[PDB]
Amino acid sequence: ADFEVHMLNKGKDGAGVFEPASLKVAPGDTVTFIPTDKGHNVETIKGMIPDGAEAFKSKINENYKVTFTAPGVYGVKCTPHYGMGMVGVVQVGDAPANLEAVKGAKNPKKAQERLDAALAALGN
Ligand SMILES: [Cu+2]
């Protein structure tokens, strides 16, 4: 299955948001990160990627597809706007084994607040 995540800032919190900021997918599912507003990208949050998964980083304003295979929770950020809290979570599969590791990862305060909420919005 494919999903879409829009990268927005006009009329939105901070310097921008991912919408949805929390997604539950299956191995092999693809998420397209869409530059609906300009100025954004998507990148792996170091410390919030399962083993078995590669990191990624898109270009600013790139329409960017990521295929998620390894089970677990993935934290993602917008590179320039990470400090301002532009982050999201993608969960691959049920019962993510790396949940405790990712809950303990360090992030800027505004990012951490949104990640904590996003993890709880996946029913974790
Ligand atoms: Cu951004």
Tell whether the torsion through CA atoms of 20, 21, 23 and 27 is positive or negative.
positive
Contact 75, 48 (CB under 8 A): yes
49 CA distance to ligand 1 middle (Å): 20
84 annotated ligand binder? no
Domains plus CATH for the chain?
1-124 (2.60.40.420)
Q: Which helix (H) or strand (E) holds 72?
A: strand 72-77
110 CA distance to ligand 1 middle (Å): 13
Return the residue matching tokens 């083993």.
51
Buried/exposed 48-78: b ≥16 CB within 10 Å, e otherwise: bbbeebeebebeeeeebebebeebbbbbbbb
Q: What does the alpha-carbon distance between residue 78 and residue 80 come to, in Å, rounded to a whole number?
A: 6
Q: What was the experiment behind these coordinates? A: X-ray
Residue 86 sits at the vertex; the CA angle it makes with 100 and 56, to the nearest 5 degrees, is 70
64 CA distance to ligand 1 middle (Å): 14
Q: What does the alpha-carbon distance between residue 118 and residue 88 come to, in Å, rounded to a whole number?
A: 7
Looking from the CA of 92 toward its CB, the CA atoms found within 13 Å total 24
121 CA distance to ligand 1 middle (Å): 21
Return the residue matching tokens 């607040």.
113
31 CA distance to ligand 1 middle (Å): 17
Backbone φ, ψ for residue 86 (5° rounding):
-85, 95
Beta strands 17-19 and 43-44 are unpaired
Beta strands 22-25 and 87-92 are parallel
CA–CA distances in Å: residue 39 to residues 24, 72, 77:
26, 28, 13
